[PDB]
């Protein structure tokens with residue numbers, strides 16, 4: 001009876017899909033231990049998932065928190081929190097190796113690492129254990145990451161010099177250079193975060209294979225590119241397996257309020273607004289959204305974080321028969337699949353994008369950071385299941401644009417065709433997940449390959 005070791009990167013978007021991956025391993029007769037490397041206590045992702053609650057919810061998974069590593073020396077004023085996180089994660093590889101040596105060797109099936117824990121491949125390599133990266137982003141994003149070394153090698157300036165000039169990667173929709181992850185727009189030699197982030201992320205292909213949280217029919221060109229010898233000249237990439245979509249007190253009350261209210265709304269009527277595990281609009285922006293939402297006349301369910309006075313006077317009273325505003329953390333997956341939900345105003349994180357795709361809900365795209373601006377292009381231009389919200393790169397989206405785009409998705413003929421394409425993709429997501437469907441077949445091919453290694 002073998003044990004898979006799951007070793008996620010920090011953050012809701014890395015841990016939540018890994019828990020779902022764990023359930024797949026369990027369904028296939030593996031034991032699971034999920035090894036948790038906590039970031040620095042100053043990380044916005046520090047204990048953002050309540051692991052005590054997660055363990056209680058999944059008693060068949062063994063959860064193991066690694067002993068802490070020193071980092072105060074690195075925690076200098078002004079350091080980008082993600083640079084500190086990348087450095088801290090490299091420092092955990094000693095504790096990870098001590099833990100892995102504590103497990104009877106013959107019982108180890110594989111090591112599956114998050115996409116910012118890739119240096120742990122050296123630990124599995126040394127122990128003779130197959131290592132896989134769990135890539136929690138799109139397959140197109142993986143295809144970009146694989147091709148970024150070649151793009152950056154000849155350069156004497158950062159990609160910021162290109163402005164909105166399109167970047168072209170094999171298998172990937174063109175997207176403006178400015179929409180690349182922002183930190184990668186600096187010259188690698190000029191910015192430690194750029195160099196470190198590229199050096200870490202690029203190693204997702206240095207193991208035995210990659211488990212991607214996507215379904216092949218959503219991203220067929222990107223999956224083809226990853227198997228194409230030109231993708232990374234002079235290199236054969238390991239196997240890529242599309243195994244998704246893998247979708248997973250005060251919050252308990254909020255969830256109850258949300259779903260009971262949605263149950264009383266007409267089908268496809270509600271605009272849901274929810275912006276990631278940690279994005280927050282300014283107070284001024286929240287007011288602007290509220291005015292556009294009210295003006296649109298549509299029903300809405302709006303998850304609001306306190307900025308990091310919110311609404312016009314009387315906004316809540318006037319909208320009480322068509323809208324519900326809740327605080328801070330909403331049951332997003334259950335809202336998205338609710339038949340009353342008709343649109344999703346999103347920050348375009350990949351889990352959120354997959355959740356909406358799998359539910360058949362068209363998107364109003366408001367990307368903030370990470371690869372969210374890339375996801376926005378993939379959703380609006382590649383997939384065609386969302387719309388842009390003008391001003392998203394400028395620091396303020398006007399109430400006129402909020403109303404215009406809510407009405408476009410919810411009332412216009414263009415919106416109806418958009419919804420129809422979203423429903424088609426939902427159907428494909430469901431096909432991917434059916435018994436003996438593509439994502440089970442892919443997971444089975446991964447299990448065969450890992451056993452044979």
Ligand SMILES: O=c1ccn([C@@H]2O[C@H](COP(=O)(O)OP(=O)(O)O)[C@@H](O)[C@H]2O)c(=O)[nH]1
Nearest residue numbers: 013276277278329330332333349350351352
């Ligand atoms: O109020 C909220 C905000 C976020 N989420 C979940 O938080 C995840 C966010 O992950 P994503 O990759 O979209 O973006 P990130 O937070 O990493 O930027 C998703 O699974 C959402 O369903 C949620 O359930 N309720």
